[PDB]
Design an enzyme around this catalytic site. Sequence first.
Site, PDB file in Angstrom:
ATOM      1  N   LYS E  56      33.179 119.245  76.285  1.00  0.00           N
ATOM      2  CA  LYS E  56      31.862 119.873  76.112  1.00  0.00           C
ATOM      3  C   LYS E  56      31.006 119.563  77.346  1.00  0.00           C
ATOM      4  O   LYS E  56      31.251 118.540  77.988  1.00  0.00           O
ATOM      5  CB  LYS E  56      31.163 119.349  74.834  1.00  0.00           C
ATOM      6  CG  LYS E  56      31.952 119.501  73.532  1.00  0.00           C
ATOM      7  CD  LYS E  56      32.059 120.950  73.070  1.00  0.00           C
ATOM      8  CE  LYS E  56      33.058 121.060  71.936  1.00  0.00           C
ATOM      9  NZ  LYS E  56      33.276 122.469  71.490  1.00  0.00           N
ATOM     10  N   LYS E  82      41.346 119.223  75.249  1.00  0.00           N
ATOM     11  CA  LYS E  82      41.607 120.665  75.305  1.00  0.00           C
ATOM     12  C   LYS E  82      40.475 121.441  75.953  1.00  0.00           C
ATOM     13  O   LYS E  82      39.320 121.007  75.946  1.00  0.00           O
ATOM     14  CB  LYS E  82      41.886 121.243  73.905  1.00  0.00           C
ATOM     15  CG  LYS E  82      40.692 121.198  72.935  1.00  0.00           C
ATOM     16  CD  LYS E  82      41.059 121.643  71.520  1.00  0.00           C
ATOM     17  CE  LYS E  82      41.267 123.161  71.394  1.00  0.00           C
ATOM     18  NZ  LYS E  82      40.025 123.884  71.796  1.00  0.00           N
ATOM     19  N   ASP E  84      37.904 124.380  75.657  1.00  0.00           N
ATOM     20  CA  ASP E  84      37.281 125.096  74.555  1.00  0.00           C
ATOM     21  C   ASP E  84      37.949 126.465  74.435  1.00  0.00           C
ATOM     22  O   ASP E  84      38.422 127.028  75.445  1.00  0.00           O
ATOM     23  CB  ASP E  84      35.766 125.234  74.763  1.00  0.00           C
ATOM     24  CG  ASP E  84      34.970 124.793  73.545  1.00  0.00           C
ATOM     25  OD1 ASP E  84      35.389 125.129  72.419  1.00  0.00           O
ATOM     26  OD2 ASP E  84      33.929 124.084  73.597  1.00  0.00           O
ATOM     27  N   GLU E  85      37.993 127.006  73.215  1.00  0.00           N
ATOM     28  CA  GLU E  85      38.627 128.302  72.991  1.00  0.00           C
ATOM     29  C   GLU E  85      38.161 129.385  73.976  1.00  0.00           C
ATOM     30  O   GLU E  85      38.957 130.251  74.375  1.00  0.00           O
ATOM     31  CB  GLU E  85      38.441 128.762  71.534  1.00  0.00           C
ATOM     32  CG  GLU E  85      37.041 129.240  71.151  1.00  0.00           C
ATOM     33  CD  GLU E  85      36.051 128.104  70.934  1.00  0.00           C
ATOM     34  OE1 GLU E  85      36.440 127.035  70.396  1.00  0.00           O
ATOM     35  OE2 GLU E  85      34.871 128.287  71.303  1.00  0.00           O
ATOM     36  N   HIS E 175      44.610 128.213  68.669  1.00  0.00           N
ATOM     37  CA  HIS E 175      43.239 128.247  68.193  1.00  0.00           C
ATOM     38  C   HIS E 175      43.010 129.520  67.397  1.00  0.00           C
ATOM     39  O   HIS E 175      43.431 130.606  67.812  1.00  0.00           O
ATOM     40  CB  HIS E 175      42.263 128.191  69.364  1.00  0.00           C
ATOM     41  CG  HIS E 175      40.850 127.918  68.950  1.00  0.00           C
ATOM     42  ND1 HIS E 175      40.011 128.907  68.497  1.00  0.00           N
ATOM     43  CD2 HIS E 175      40.128 126.772  68.931  1.00  0.00           C
ATOM     44  CE1 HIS E 175      38.836 128.386  68.196  1.00  0.00           C
ATOM     45  NE2 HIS E 175      38.878 127.091  68.454  1.00  0.00           N
ATOM     46  N   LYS E 215      31.745 120.628  60.154  1.00  0.00           N
ATOM     47  CA  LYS E 215      30.708 121.653  60.291  1.00  0.00           C
ATOM     48  C   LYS E 215      31.147 123.054  59.863  1.00  0.00           C
ATOM     49  O   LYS E 215      30.302 123.923  59.619  1.00  0.00           O
ATOM     50  CB  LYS E 215      30.162 121.669  61.731  1.00  0.00           C
ATOM     51  CG  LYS E 215      31.127 122.247  62.766  1.00  0.00           C
ATOM     52  CD  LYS E 215      30.684 121.940  64.180  1.00  0.00           C
ATOM     53  CE  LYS E 215      31.563 122.692  65.177  1.00  0.00           C
ATOM     54  NZ  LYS E 215      31.292 122.305  66.583  1.00  0.00           N
TER      55      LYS E 215
HETATM   56  O1  LIG Z   1      34.375 125.021  69.728  1.00  0.00           O
HETATM   57  C1  LIG Z   1      34.312 124.054  68.708  1.00  0.00           C
HETATM   58  O2  LIG Z   1      33.286 124.041  67.908  1.00  0.00           O
HETATM   59  C2  LIG Z   1      35.450 123.060  68.592  1.00  0.00           C
HETATM   60  O3  LIG Z   1      35.796 122.794  69.976  1.00  0.00           O
HETATM   61  C3  LIG Z   1      35.032 121.729  67.958  1.00  0.00           C
HETATM   62  O4  LIG Z   1      34.062 121.059  68.741  1.00  0.00           O
HETATM   63  P1  LIG Z   1      33.485 119.656  68.184  1.00  0.00           P
HETATM   64  O5  LIG Z   1      34.636 118.631  68.116  1.00  0.00           O
HETATM   65  O6  LIG Z   1      32.459 119.181  69.142  1.00  0.00           O
HETATM   66  O7  LIG Z   1      32.923 119.873  66.774  1.00  0.00           O
HETATM   67  C4  LIG Z   1      36.641 123.686  67.854  1.00  0.00           C
HETATM   68  O8  LIG Z   1      37.050 124.835  68.580  1.00  0.00           O
HETATM   69  C5  LIG Z   1      36.339 124.044  66.389  1.00  0.00           C
HETATM   70  O9  LIG Z   1      36.819 123.021  65.546  1.00  0.00           O
HETATM   71  C6  LIG Z   1      36.958 125.363  65.952  1.00  0.00           C
HETATM   72  O10 LIG Z   1      36.769 125.591  64.566  1.00  0.00           O
HETATM   73  P2  LIG Z   1      38.036 125.612  63.567  1.00  0.00           P
HETATM   74  O11 LIG Z   1      38.819 124.306  63.773  1.00  0.00           O
HETATM   75  O12 LIG Z   1      37.598 125.655  62.151  1.00  0.00           O
HETATM   76  O13 LIG Z   1      38.938 126.816  63.885  1.00  0.00           O
HETATM   77 MG   LIG Z   2      36.127 125.025  70.617  1.00  0.00          MG
END
Ligand SMILES: O=C(O)[C@@](O)(COP(=O)(O)O)[C@H](O)[C@H](O)COP(=O)(O)O
Ligand SMILES: [Mg+2]
Lengths: 140, 140, 465, 467, 356, 228
Positions: E56, E82, E84-85, E175, E215
């Site tokens: 982040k 990783k 981020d998506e 993802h 969350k």
């Molecule tokens: O972009 C985000 O919010 C995250 O990097 C989490 O960040 P944090 O660790 O800072 O919360 C993940 O991609 C989410 O968990 C995706 O949701 P899901 O797993 O439900 O598909």
């Molecule tokens: Mg993410």
Amino acid sequence: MMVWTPVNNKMFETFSYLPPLTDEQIAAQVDYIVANGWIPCLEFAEADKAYVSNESAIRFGSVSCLYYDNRYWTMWKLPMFGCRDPMQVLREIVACTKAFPDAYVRLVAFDNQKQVQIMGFLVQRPKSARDWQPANKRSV
Amino acid sequence: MMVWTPVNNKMFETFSYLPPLTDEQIAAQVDYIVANGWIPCLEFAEADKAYVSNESAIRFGSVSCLYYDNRYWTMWKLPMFGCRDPMQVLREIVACTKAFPDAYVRLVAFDNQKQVQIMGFLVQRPKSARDWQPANKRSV
Amino acid sequence: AGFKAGVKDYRLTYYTPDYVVRDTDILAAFRMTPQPGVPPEECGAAVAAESSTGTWTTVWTDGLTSLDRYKGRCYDIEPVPGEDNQYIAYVAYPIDLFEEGSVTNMFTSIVGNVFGFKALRALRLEDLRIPPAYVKTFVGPPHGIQVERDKLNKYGRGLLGCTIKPKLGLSAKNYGRAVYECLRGGLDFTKDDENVNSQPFMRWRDRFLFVTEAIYKAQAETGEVKGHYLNATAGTCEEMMKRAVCAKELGVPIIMHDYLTGGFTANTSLAIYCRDNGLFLHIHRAMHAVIDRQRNHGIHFRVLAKALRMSGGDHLHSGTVVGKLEGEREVTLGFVDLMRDDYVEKDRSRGIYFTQDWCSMPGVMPVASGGIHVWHMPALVEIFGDDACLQFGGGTLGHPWGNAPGAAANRVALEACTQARNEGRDLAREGGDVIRSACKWSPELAAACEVWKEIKFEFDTIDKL
Amino acid sequence: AGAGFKAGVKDYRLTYYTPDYVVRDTDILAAFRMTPQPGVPPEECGAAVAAESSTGTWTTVWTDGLTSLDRYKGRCYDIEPVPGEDNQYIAYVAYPIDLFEEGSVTNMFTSIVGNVFGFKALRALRLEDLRIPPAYVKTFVGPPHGIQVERDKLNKYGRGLLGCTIKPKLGLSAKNYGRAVYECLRGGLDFTKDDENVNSQPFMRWRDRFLFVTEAIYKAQAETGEVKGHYLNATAGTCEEMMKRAVCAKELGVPIIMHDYLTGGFTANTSLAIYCRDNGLFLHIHRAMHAVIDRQRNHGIHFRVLAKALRMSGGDHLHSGTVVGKLEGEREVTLGFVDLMRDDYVEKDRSRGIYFTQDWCSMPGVMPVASGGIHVWHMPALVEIFGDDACLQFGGGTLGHPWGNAPGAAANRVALEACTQARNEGRDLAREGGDVIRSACKWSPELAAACEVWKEIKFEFDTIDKL
Amino acid sequence: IVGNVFGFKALRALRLEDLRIPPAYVKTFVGPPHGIQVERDKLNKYGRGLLGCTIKPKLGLSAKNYGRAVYECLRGGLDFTKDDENVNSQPFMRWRDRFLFVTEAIYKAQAETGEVKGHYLNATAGTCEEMMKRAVCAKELGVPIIMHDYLTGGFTANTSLAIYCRDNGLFLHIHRAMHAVIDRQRNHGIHFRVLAKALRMSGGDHLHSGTVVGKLEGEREVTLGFVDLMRDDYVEKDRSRGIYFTQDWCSMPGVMPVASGGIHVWHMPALVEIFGDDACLQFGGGTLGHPWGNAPGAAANRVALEACTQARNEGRDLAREGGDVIRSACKWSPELAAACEVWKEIKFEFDTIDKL
Amino acid sequence: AGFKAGVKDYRLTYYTPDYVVRDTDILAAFRMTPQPGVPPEECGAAVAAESSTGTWTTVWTDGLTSLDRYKGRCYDIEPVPGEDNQYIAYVAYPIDLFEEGSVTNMFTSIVGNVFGFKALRALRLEDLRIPPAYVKTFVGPPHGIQVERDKLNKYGRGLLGCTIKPKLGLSAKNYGRAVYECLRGGLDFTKDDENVNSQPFMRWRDRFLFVTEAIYKAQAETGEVKGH
Ligand SMILES: O=C(O)[C@@](O)(COP(=O)(O)O)[C@H](O)[C@H](O)COP(=O)(O)O
Ligand SMILES: [Mg+2]
Ligand SMILES: O=C(O)[C@@](O)(COP(=O)(O)O)[C@H](O)[C@H](O)COP(=O)(O)O
Ligand SMILES: O=C(O)[C@@](O)(COP(=O)(O)O)[C@H](O)[C@H](O)COP(=O)(O)O
Ligand SMILES: [Mg+2]
Ligand SMILES: [Mg+2]
Ligand SMILES: [Mg+2]
């Protein structure tokens, strides 16, 4: 004609071709960081991790261009975001070198607008280091 | 702020971030193996063969992905198939460490339904090892 | 409106002084010198027409399309202060006129035919406003300043380079010999001369090999990352690519290309290859002065610099101001900003005719090279700041003690100046004192200072604002 | 002691001014029109030009001693004063053949015009001419085909070729492009072409154009029974895109593509010329941007050098100017470089701007293309200036005809053939040209209509690029 | 199955809840490049959940700063970090620069810790050609793992990538970006369990499973059901967990569930209890938001996981004693103590939309 | 401003009602249904944050870059007429956030994670403003309407198509048979059903071949350009 020595005359990027910085000279560089609103940060490495090397390239195909090990060092705590006090930086230099008396330690500063390190120089080398020369012994 | 030391702070996978296991804590882990009907086994390695490395990759084209040397260790005897006695496992730990007092030794267990190792932790490191920290010296 | 065959004034279609420019239009500022009896409105309209949609007589095919949509428009004409027959004609080109990602196509329209029109005596393209929507169609530079510093692990000072000399005539092994001795003394980079490609006295692949030995030797010796710009400039795209490939396979950091003599089409291809394989691309502007020297005719360097930024390059030569080649201070500072910065406001006192928004395209490292030596160091650091490469060819290989002492002298001078600036010293006033102070503990610098003490390059400037 | 290394700055003329040098038959020679700064002797200025385009820099380097400067140095061997100029000289420089990469125009330009034009010590510099020796000429592939092979493949003899740029320059759709093309070709034009700036754009993508134009070429060819072509533009942002476009033309079986050699560049151009040689495509060369470089008398590079460079890099056609049309080109200057483009051996002739005797050692000739602001009334002068070995192009002069493209093409083809016949019969086109055209008007209503529209249209202005 | 029928005027709403994929159809798929057993085997990691972490801020970091954050995260005890998506290739950070700096970071942290490290390098791209170029670069750097956004990239691209990963021995983290557009509402769309089955068939070594406690939404029983469908070989019909059909996977490898999003140290006991050892637990904010930085953040998460794992192994009830386990670990781990203090009050408890 | 660890409201960073959108920003209109007790400003801010630069707790790395430059911004919130708990939240995304030419990347940011947030009950993306500067990074459609009509030589009326039926179950030869009979009667096009790919009852290459025979037969018979 003086001859630039190839033995053991390792350098350390910015300011390493000058005479070793006095405390006053270091303080002046810190004043420069603060005057410009840059983010001070300390980084350190043990002697084995101090200079650029190639060992990971054993795992590569033909992709070693601009890959080197040991460019990253270890962060001391966090970058000092919001720091406007030179004395605070100087105190962290003391704390870092105290915790790691045998490590190489460098002071750096980041600019968050350009998102790049904007300055940096060595503030400590281990006293066991003998791969470097005093200013007057760099040539013979 | 405490700083996580990069020197000499090598770990050993599962449970290496906890304080060193007492004999009672080791016995409890062995009880867990037996309670679940898993197959206990001991493995060992000399210090030079203990940590993951890359030397074989010199022989490779671009195929080093998920290849590392020193993942395999040496089997102590055989996996203890049919073992339902924790004391038997504890006695083999004694026998293994006695035969190899300077080796790294780990206790593992296998699940034959999933066909995978299902637990594991270090039970001995050589007393000459100095590449690791006590729990209270991991940060400074 | 039917088709009416015959010649009519260009100004009837292409002079539109009430046109409000669109934020996606490419804008051109032309310094225009009409023939006697040609109204500036007609001359501007001719330039707009013949660089966009029009020719010398009315064509019926206009009616199948919308000329309003596509035509270039001379939308403003400025008189030039101090000139009886010189005008700045401003032309707007719709974005639809241009091939996405093609500097070649942009130049072909804007500077293709209009400079040869009998109806004008001289024409000079001073500036181009490249809109974000067009900027975004370009890959741009392989890496850019921030990434370059990050891969090199070099911060807090200008970079130092050096052209090997003599220009031509050295063998491959002697090239590597000179390179090793230069790099080991404190220079970050050396380079092939622009005209060092592959020749009877030195074939390229032999050079690449020996230079590679030299880079890695100097790097190991100093503990600092080293490079040498290996020239990929060639007669064909295929030879150029072969050379880039060899550098990739040797794992070395940086190649160079002469973008104007090689050309934009080859250059863009090379920049893309460099992006895809993580090679730095140094750009030499060989031949620029054929085009950009004269005030009355040609294309100002600032446009050539923008074109290069779009086509792709990590470095581009910027001039020195103080060295053997021309470059006036204010002109230079203006295009240096245009090369490095994300957003540059209109500023005619620096020759910036249009506000330029680069919409996050990476900045290009300016390279100050040519006829400079240790005494110039304070002025160079003051002019350029840290984000530049300063190159000393003769200023290294002309040191009385050889390349390594020569490199050390330059590196000492740079670091002394950098330290002094950081301490609050005024380099413009105290620069001489900074150098003289450093001479006391650096015999290498003292020897360089002695040899070049009297050497200056001060001449009447041709390319004045 | 003999000659040691002596650090420091000395005059360039001590090494690079050699007025007694006898040039070798393998040397590349350059004629530079040079304007020195006040207080810079012409010998020093010429020496600096020679030095900094060959082996030298601003201060003495020790590495000279590892090699033989005598063997490699450029030499200013002669300086001529310019009649009528107080501060202009022709400086002659000889470059050893060893300095140059075989087959690379890019490398030749990099040395000769790389850095010297920006030197503070000079006020202006113009490369007027280059002597390319046979030994260097022979390292180049050169043009894909050349004039003789072009005529042979087209089966066209005994007259100028006729071309035509489609208009408006930009803004036409692919289908409308092919529509305009068909109508032009069917009326008697041999060729049409993409405008130099027609590449691939939102209003018309290249591959759509190539397809519709291909339909138009083959329709007009079947209709007329004469071989037709259209210069499909391969000019592109990258070498990969350029090649994709050439490949498509090859696969459509069409005769001819074009390239803007200066805006695309010599490296791309040489590659394309080689591809064209290997796949039997004609390569038309457009000289877009030349006038940025070649317009002014005091500074730049004369077009004759740009034309020699193209001949070496490779092209079947190159635009030559019209003399009489909308773009500048003085008669004597033009006749000079036209010979340099077409002929095998061209003797020194300063009255046509030819500074050096040029021996092309059997490299194929390039077809001059006269294009830009010309119409039917220009025909006699064009035929007289160029002779049969030229392509004459009428863009506006075809698509501006009141009756449309086919009548426009017919008018131009009639005018050309009438002028050709008249010349063949012994008529003097310079004097009788108006009469030839008027006679043809009696039986050609297409020509009559063209003549009426453009009767008063001339392009006569003071010439900038004068000898 | 879902092509046209959801838009029919004759219906108001339609939701695909489940699919029974028969062995004879399962057998036509290559399936996941490796699967859980092979993954653990290649990593040499056994006996605990794996630990991950999204770097982040999501966007806006430079390549070198990315590698800097990565090294500091991995060296503190995380197995993985990783992209981020939505980190693909962008003006502030081009992909290949990132791959290089991250590679330096992976190898530095691995050498420092003596544990195998990885970072999911994003191969998600606008075209198949770009996607493949990114996978090839990862292969040539010798790094363990890449990632793909299977829904935004798509099944055709994903299947291709999974096959490349099988053929070149790369792990493929999946993802599920955009899944909630489809799977959130009870009355209309496709339940996640079907999207999970589809992914298992198309191919992936990891797939995000939700956290239950974090969350993002995921009801406990619903989640446990599809987690079994992702990991197991044979899953009996069980409507109390949303399993409408008995599903026989006929030996197709299991996919590692990844619990990620809004989780921190105090959630550790519940996570371990819910998922068991065969999961990757990811702490992005929960690492890079630690007051002492990434390495201490990583150490706090790794300490919490191992403490919980030990406690479970000893017979302790994580549902009841979890708070006590964490508090005990705080006594000898100042990194964990600092993490516990910052996030002590932080919970995510809302009315569930996707109810059975 | 130092790094302060811990959770704070998203709205403190990501709700910017006075922001003037730039002509290069990508804009999104979200129909948003917040959970009870979540202010619409906080909900809109959460959507903006988690589709751009932010996560659930403060991260120190923000300070290395410029959050102002990169953050998504909820810049306006409209109540929906006739709804007690529905809002249109407008979010602006800087062009720098997106990979050139990648619809995949655009969707990944804007609709990647935010639809699953516990803090909202429902979310619908209604519209996107794609700015010219982003549009220009895409190749876009292979031909488009004008070029299509031009290559087909078809003008002055709608084009006519037809899906072959039954959807599945026809052999390759019967597919071509149906296609020929359709095209020859005056349809410009026929088509494979969406779910006709390659299957046991009809493999794709056999179908391509038989359909090709049918296209060319109908074209020769009618004198009109045909396709399938
Ligand atoms: O972009 C985000 O919010 C995250 O990097 C989490 O960040 P944090 O660790 O800072 O919360 C993940 O991609 C989410 O968990 C995706 O949701 P899901 O797993 O439900 O598909
Ligand atoms: Mg993410
Ligand atoms: O060939 C030369 O003269 C140089 O190698 C410099 O040599 P020295 O360091 O020995 O002077 C550079 O190429 C010029 O500076 C180019 O000029 P510019 O940067 O203006 O394009
Ligand atoms: O773009 C044009 O103006 C032309 O298409 C001619 O159009 P018209 O036939 O309608 O005049 C040619 O490209 C010029 O002749 C180029 O100039 P040159 O030949 O001098 O290089
Ligand atoms: Mg040079
Ligand atoms: Mg033209
Ligand atoms: Mg259908």
